[PDB]
Design a protein around this motif. Sequence first.
Motif, PDB file in Angstrom:
ATOM      1  N   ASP A  93       0.783  -1.249   0.000  1.00  0.00           N
ATOM      2  CA  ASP A  93       0.000   0.000   0.000  1.00  0.00           C
ATOM      3  C   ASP A  93       0.804   1.283   0.000  1.00  0.00           C
ATOM      4  O   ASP A  93       0.459   2.218  -0.701  1.00  0.00           O
ATOM      5  CB  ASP A  93      -0.946   0.035   1.202  1.00  0.00           C
ATOM      6  CG  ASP A  93      -2.049  -1.004   1.107  1.00  0.00           C
ATOM      7  OD1 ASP A  93      -2.449  -1.354  -0.048  1.00  0.00           O
ATOM      8  OD2 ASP A  93      -2.499  -1.470   2.196  1.00  0.00           O
TER       9      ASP A  93
ATOM     10  N   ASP B  66       3.262   3.716  -3.167  1.00  0.00           N
ATOM     11  CA  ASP B  66       2.978   4.924  -3.967  1.00  0.00           C
ATOM     12  C   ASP B  66       3.755   6.140  -3.456  1.00  0.00           C
ATOM     13  O   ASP B  66       4.187   7.001  -4.238  1.00  0.00           O
ATOM     14  CB  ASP B  66       1.477   5.268  -3.939  1.00  0.00           C
ATOM     15  CG  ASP B  66       0.670   4.502  -4.977  1.00  0.00           C
ATOM     16  OD1 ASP B  66       1.255   4.063  -5.999  1.00  0.00           O
ATOM     17  OD2 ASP B  66      -0.559   4.354  -4.771  1.00  0.00           O
ATOM     18  N   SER B  67       3.887   6.199  -2.136  1.00  0.00           N
ATOM     19  CA  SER B  67       4.560   7.254  -1.410  1.00  0.00           C
ATOM     20  C   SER B  67       6.060   7.319  -1.648  1.00  0.00           C
ATOM     21  O   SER B  67       6.686   8.322  -1.305  1.00  0.00           O
ATOM     22  CB  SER B  67       4.353   7.016   0.085  1.00  0.00           C
ATOM     23  OG  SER B  67       2.980   6.802   0.392  1.00  0.00           O
TER      24      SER B  67
ATOM     25  N   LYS C 158       7.595   6.058  -4.796  1.00  0.00           N
ATOM     26  CA  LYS C 158       7.784   5.653  -6.180  1.00  0.00           C
ATOM     27  C   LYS C 158       9.152   5.970  -6.830  1.00  0.00           C
ATOM     28  O   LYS C 158       9.672   5.159  -7.612  1.00  0.00           O
ATOM     29  CB  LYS C 158       6.641   6.223  -7.046  1.00  0.00           C
ATOM     30  CG  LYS C 158       6.666   5.789  -8.552  1.00  0.00           C
ATOM     31  CD  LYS C 158       5.790   6.711  -9.436  1.00  0.00           C
ATOM     32  CE  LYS C 158       5.891   6.392 -10.941  1.00  0.00           C
ATOM     33  NZ  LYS C 158       5.156   5.153 -11.261  1.00  0.00           N
TER      34      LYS C 158
ATOM     35  N   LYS D  77       2.708  -4.711  -7.834  1.00  0.00           N
ATOM     36  CA  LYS D  77       2.915  -3.371  -7.310  1.00  0.00           C
ATOM     37  C   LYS D  77       4.375  -3.092  -7.035  1.00  0.00           C
ATOM     38  O   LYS D  77       4.746  -1.937  -6.853  1.00  0.00           O
ATOM     39  CB  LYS D  77       2.066  -3.121  -6.060  1.00  0.00           C
ATOM     40  CG  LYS D  77       0.560  -3.169  -6.329  1.00  0.00           C
ATOM     41  CD  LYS D  77      -0.287  -2.614  -5.185  1.00  0.00           C
ATOM     42  CE  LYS D  77      -1.767  -2.960  -5.383  1.00  0.00           C
ATOM     43  NZ  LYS D  77      -2.685  -2.463  -4.300  1.00  0.00           N
TER      44      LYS D  77
ATOM     45  N   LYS E 215       5.952  -1.371 -10.232  1.00  0.00           N
ATOM     46  CA  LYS E 215       5.559   0.009 -10.552  1.00  0.00           C
ATOM     47  C   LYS E 215       6.551   1.037  -9.960  1.00  0.00           C
ATOM     48  O   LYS E 215       6.403   2.243 -10.146  1.00  0.00           O
ATOM     49  CB  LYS E 215       4.137   0.311 -10.018  1.00  0.00           C
ATOM     50  CG  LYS E 215       2.994  -0.521 -10.587  1.00  0.00           C
ATOM     51  CD  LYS E 215       2.426   0.037 -11.904  1.00  0.00           C
ATOM     52  CE  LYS E 215       0.884   0.284 -11.844  1.00  0.00           C
ATOM     53  NZ  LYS E 215       0.014  -0.942 -11.643  1.00  0.00           N
TER      54      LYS E 215
END
Length: 257
Positions: free
Chosen positions: A158, A161-162, A164, A221, A224
Amino acid sequence: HWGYGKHNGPEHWHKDFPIAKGERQSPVDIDTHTAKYDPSLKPLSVSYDQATSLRILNNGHAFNVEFDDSQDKAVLKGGPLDGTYRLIQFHFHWGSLDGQGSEHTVDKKKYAAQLHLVHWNTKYGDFGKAVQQPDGLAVLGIFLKVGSAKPGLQKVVDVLDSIKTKGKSADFTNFDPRGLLPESLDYWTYPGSLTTPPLLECVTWIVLKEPISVSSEQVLKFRKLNFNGEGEPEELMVDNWRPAQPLKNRQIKASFK
Protein backbone atom coordinates in the motif's frame (compact mmCIF):
# COMPACT_ATOMS: atom_id res chain seq x y z
CA HIS A 1 26.99 4.37 -11.05
CA TRP A 2 26.31 0.62 -10.60
CA GLY A 3 22.90 -0.72 -11.34
CA TYR A 4 21.12 -3.43 -13.28
CA GLY A 5 21.28 -2.10 -16.85
CA LYS A 6 23.34 -3.43 -19.77
CA HIS A 7 25.78 -0.61 -19.22
CA ASN A 8 26.19 -0.56 -15.47
CA GLY A 9 24.84 -4.03 -14.82
CA PRO A 10 26.03 -6.81 -12.53
CA GLU A 11 28.55 -7.82 -15.26
CA HIS A 12 30.37 -4.49 -14.87
CA TRP A 13 30.54 -4.27 -11.07
CA HIS A 14 34.05 -5.81 -10.95
CA LYS A 15 35.59 -2.69 -12.52
CA ASP A 16 34.57 -0.66 -9.47
CA PHE A 17 34.36 -3.42 -6.87
CA PRO A 18 37.09 -5.94 -7.75
CA ILE A 19 35.76 -8.20 -5.01
CA ALA A 20 32.93 -9.03 -7.42
CA LYS A 21 35.27 -11.82 -8.55
CA GLY A 22 36.01 -12.84 -5.01
CA GLU A 23 36.18 -16.25 -3.40
CA ARG A 24 33.04 -16.13 -1.23
CA GLN A 25 30.50 -14.15 -3.34
CA SER A 26 26.67 -14.34 -3.36
CA PRO A 27 24.11 -15.40 -4.57
CA VAL A 28 24.83 -19.02 -5.63
CA ASP A 29 22.73 -21.95 -6.90
CA ILE A 30 21.74 -24.33 -4.09
CA ASP A 31 22.11 -27.90 -5.36
CA THR A 32 19.78 -29.82 -3.04
CA HIS A 33 21.47 -33.11 -3.82
CA THR A 34 25.05 -32.36 -2.97
CA ALA A 35 24.17 -30.08 -0.02
CA LYS A 36 25.61 -31.62 3.12
CA TYR A 37 22.95 -32.24 5.73
CA ASP A 38 24.57 -31.11 8.96
CA PRO A 39 22.92 -32.40 12.16
CA SER A 40 25.03 -30.41 14.65
CA LEU A 41 23.15 -27.27 13.58
CA LYS A 42 21.12 -25.82 16.42
CA PRO A 43 17.72 -24.50 15.31
CA LEU A 44 17.04 -20.84 14.48
CA SER A 45 15.84 -18.52 17.25
CA VAL A 46 13.93 -15.63 15.62
CA SER A 47 12.40 -13.09 18.02
CA TYR A 48 10.59 -10.30 16.31
CA ASP A 49 8.02 -9.70 19.06
CA GLN A 50 9.69 -6.41 19.94
CA ALA A 51 10.63 -5.20 16.49
CA THR A 52 10.38 -1.45 15.76
CA SER A 53 10.04 -0.64 12.06
CA LEU A 54 10.59 3.06 11.26
CA ARG A 55 10.98 4.10 7.60
CA ILE A 56 10.62 2.72 4.16
CA LEU A 57 12.70 4.26 1.34
CA ASN A 58 13.35 3.85 -2.34
CA ASN A 59 17.10 3.91 -2.57
CA GLY A 60 17.21 3.74 -6.36
CA HIS A 61 18.13 0.03 -6.27
CA ALA A 62 15.34 -1.39 -4.11
CA PHE A 63 13.02 -0.31 -1.28
CA ASN A 64 14.00 -0.80 2.35
CA VAL A 65 12.04 -1.06 5.57
CA GLU A 66 14.32 0.09 8.42
CA PHE A 67 14.12 -0.90 12.09
CA ASP A 68 15.47 0.63 15.27
CA ASP A 69 18.58 -1.38 16.18
CA SER A 70 19.77 0.71 19.12
CA GLN A 71 18.88 -2.21 21.36
CA ASP A 72 18.20 -5.91 21.04
CA LYS A 73 14.64 -5.53 19.82
CA ALA A 74 14.34 -8.04 17.01
CA VAL A 75 17.23 -10.51 17.06
CA LEU A 76 18.35 -13.66 15.21
CA LYS A 77 20.22 -16.47 17.06
CA GLY A 78 20.59 -20.23 16.75
CA GLY A 79 21.38 -21.97 13.53
CA PRO A 80 25.05 -21.70 12.57
CA LEU A 81 25.51 -18.38 14.38
CA ASP A 82 27.44 -17.44 17.43
CA GLY A 83 26.04 -14.44 19.21
CA THR A 84 23.08 -12.17 18.77
CA TYR A 85 22.49 -10.56 15.40
CA ARG A 86 20.05 -7.64 15.37
CA LEU A 87 17.68 -6.75 12.50
CA ILE A 88 18.65 -3.52 10.86
CA GLN A 89 16.65 -3.66 7.57
CA PHE A 90 14.85 -5.84 5.03
CA HIS A 91 14.58 -5.56 1.20
CA PHE A 92 13.41 -7.47 -1.88
CA HIS A 93 14.62 -8.44 -5.32
CA TRP A 94 12.07 -9.02 -8.02
CA GLY A 95 11.80 -9.67 -11.74
CA SER A 96 9.83 -8.25 -14.60
CA LEU A 97 8.13 -11.63 -15.01
CA ASP A 98 6.98 -14.24 -12.51
CA GLY A 99 9.68 -16.64 -13.60
CA GLN A 100 12.65 -14.65 -12.43
CA GLY A 101 13.41 -12.37 -9.55
CA SER A 102 15.13 -14.39 -6.87
CA GLU A 103 18.94 -14.07 -6.49
CA HIS A 104 19.49 -17.54 -5.05
CA THR A 105 18.14 -20.46 -7.07
CA VAL A 106 17.34 -23.94 -5.88
CA ASP A 107 18.65 -26.55 -8.29
CA LYS A 108 18.71 -23.70 -10.85
CA LYS A 109 15.04 -22.81 -10.23
CA LYS A 110 14.30 -19.07 -10.03
CA TYR A 111 11.56 -17.63 -7.86
CA ALA A 112 9.32 -14.58 -8.43
CA ALA A 113 11.16 -12.56 -5.73
CA GLN A 114 13.39 -12.96 -2.68
CA LEU A 115 13.43 -11.18 0.67
CA HIS A 116 16.51 -10.44 2.72
CA LEU A 117 16.09 -9.61 6.38
CA VAL A 118 19.50 -8.15 7.29
CA HIS A 119 21.10 -8.60 10.72
CA TRP A 120 24.51 -7.50 12.09
CA ASN A 121 26.76 -9.10 14.84
CA THR A 122 26.37 -7.06 17.99
CA LYS A 123 29.83 -8.01 19.21
CA TYR A 124 30.94 -5.43 16.67
CA GLY A 125 29.11 -2.29 17.90
CA ASP A 126 27.70 -0.92 14.67
CA PHE A 127 26.73 -2.03 11.18
CA GLY A 128 29.68 -0.24 9.68
CA LYS A 129 32.18 -2.25 11.68
CA ALA A 130 30.16 -5.43 11.26
CA VAL A 131 30.54 -5.39 7.46
CA GLN A 132 34.33 -5.43 8.05
CA GLN A 133 34.18 -8.95 9.54
CA PRO A 134 33.92 -12.47 8.05
CA ASP A 135 31.04 -13.03 10.49
CA GLY A 136 29.46 -9.61 10.54
CA LEU A 137 26.01 -10.06 9.05
CA ALA A 138 23.43 -12.83 9.09
CA VAL A 139 21.02 -12.47 6.19
CA LEU A 140 17.77 -14.50 6.20
CA GLY A 141 16.59 -15.12 2.64
CA ILE A 142 13.03 -16.13 1.85
CA PHE A 143 11.71 -16.95 -1.62
CA LEU A 144 8.38 -15.63 -2.83
CA LYS A 145 6.30 -17.59 -5.28
CA VAL A 146 3.13 -16.30 -6.95
CA GLY A 147 -0.12 -17.94 -5.82
CA SER A 148 -2.36 -16.83 -2.94
CA ALA A 149 -1.85 -13.50 -1.16
CA LYS A 150 0.29 -12.92 1.85
CA PRO A 151 -1.92 -10.76 4.11
CA GLY A 152 1.01 -9.56 6.23
CA LEU A 153 2.77 -8.09 3.21
CA GLN A 154 -0.13 -5.93 2.00
CA LYS A 155 0.75 -3.14 4.44
CA VAL A 156 3.99 -2.78 2.53
CA VAL A 157 2.25 -3.01 -0.85
CA ASP A 158 0.00 0.00 0.00
CA VAL A 159 2.70 2.51 0.94
CA LEU A 160 4.67 1.92 -2.29
CA ASP A 161 2.98 4.92 -3.97
CA SER A 162 4.56 7.25 -1.41
CA ILE A 163 8.09 6.19 -2.42
CA LYS A 164 7.78 5.65 -6.18
CA THR A 165 11.00 7.50 -7.14
CA LYS A 166 14.57 7.15 -6.04
CA GLY A 167 15.11 9.06 -2.84
CA LYS A 168 11.60 9.28 -1.39
CA SER A 169 11.09 7.77 2.06
CA ALA A 170 8.10 7.55 4.36
CA ASP A 171 7.34 6.74 7.97
CA PHE A 172 6.50 3.13 8.47
CA THR A 173 5.96 2.38 12.15
CA ASN A 174 4.23 -0.62 13.72
CA PHE A 175 5.08 -3.10 10.98
CA ASP A 176 5.46 -6.73 12.24
CA PRO A 177 8.04 -8.73 10.30
CA ARG A 178 6.62 -11.99 11.64
CA GLY A 179 3.93 -11.91 9.01
CA LEU A 180 6.52 -12.41 6.28
CA LEU A 181 7.90 -15.67 7.75
CA PRO A 182 6.90 -19.11 6.42
CA GLU A 183 5.61 -21.94 8.65
CA SER A 184 8.81 -24.01 8.76
CA LEU A 185 12.28 -22.78 9.66
CA ASP A 186 14.32 -25.53 7.89
CA TYR A 187 17.22 -23.95 6.02
CA TRP A 188 20.49 -24.10 4.08
CA THR A 189 23.47 -22.05 5.16
CA TYR A 190 26.79 -21.09 3.67
CA PRO A 191 29.30 -18.19 3.92
CA GLY A 192 28.98 -15.45 1.30
CA SER A 193 28.75 -11.73 0.55
CA LEU A 194 26.41 -8.81 0.11
CA THR A 195 24.62 -9.08 -3.28
CA THR A 196 25.20 -5.39 -4.06
CA PRO A 197 28.15 -3.06 -3.87
CA PRO A 198 30.29 -2.95 -1.85
CA LEU A 199 29.78 -6.73 -2.18
CA LEU A 200 31.73 -7.33 1.04
CA GLU A 201 32.28 -10.90 2.12
CA CYS A 202 30.79 -10.68 5.65
CA VAL A 203 27.66 -12.78 5.45
CA THR A 204 26.52 -16.07 6.80
CA TRP A 205 23.60 -16.73 4.51
CA ILE A 206 20.58 -18.50 5.90
CA VAL A 207 18.14 -19.33 3.11
CA LEU A 208 14.84 -20.77 4.31
CA LYS A 209 13.80 -23.88 2.41
CA GLU A 210 10.13 -22.96 2.44
CA PRO A 211 8.87 -20.07 0.29
CA ILE A 212 5.88 -17.82 0.99
CA SER A 213 3.10 -17.18 -1.51
CA VAL A 214 2.06 -13.71 -2.74
CA SER A 215 -0.67 -12.89 -5.26
CA SER A 216 0.16 -11.59 -8.73
CA GLU A 217 -1.32 -8.10 -8.05
CA GLN A 218 0.65 -7.98 -4.82
CA VAL A 219 3.99 -8.57 -6.64
CA LEU A 220 2.66 -6.46 -9.52
CA LYS A 221 2.91 -3.37 -7.31
CA PHE A 222 6.64 -4.05 -6.79
CA ARG A 223 7.09 -3.52 -10.56
CA LYS A 224 5.56 0.01 -10.55
CA LEU A 225 8.52 1.39 -8.59
CA ASN A 226 11.23 3.54 -10.20
CA PHE A 227 15.02 3.31 -10.39
CA ASN A 228 15.07 6.94 -11.46
CA GLY A 229 14.82 10.00 -9.30
CA GLU A 230 11.91 12.41 -9.53
CA GLY A 231 11.73 14.45 -12.70
CA GLU A 232 13.78 12.03 -14.73
CA PRO A 233 12.76 9.58 -17.47
CA GLU A 234 10.87 6.63 -16.03
CA GLU A 235 12.99 3.53 -15.66
CA LEU A 236 10.82 0.90 -13.96
CA MET A 237 12.42 -0.99 -11.06
CA VAL A 238 12.25 -4.61 -12.26
CA ASP A 239 14.92 -7.30 -12.32
CA ASN A 240 17.02 -5.77 -9.54
CA TRP A 241 18.83 -9.08 -8.91
CA ARG A 242 22.37 -10.35 -9.24
CA PRO A 243 22.95 -13.67 -11.05
CA ALA A 244 24.28 -16.76 -9.24
CA GLN A 245 28.04 -16.85 -8.58
CA PRO A 246 30.50 -19.83 -8.62
CA LEU A 247 30.48 -21.72 -5.30
CA LYS A 248 34.24 -22.33 -5.16
CA ASN A 249 35.79 -23.61 -1.90
CA ARG A 250 32.41 -23.60 -0.17
CA GLN A 251 30.00 -26.16 1.14
CA ILE A 252 26.29 -25.54 1.70
CA LYS A 253 25.16 -27.27 4.84
CA ALA A 254 21.47 -28.04 5.45
CA SER A 255 19.56 -28.29 8.74
CA PHE A 256 17.24 -30.97 7.46
CA LYS A 257 16.71 -34.34 5.87
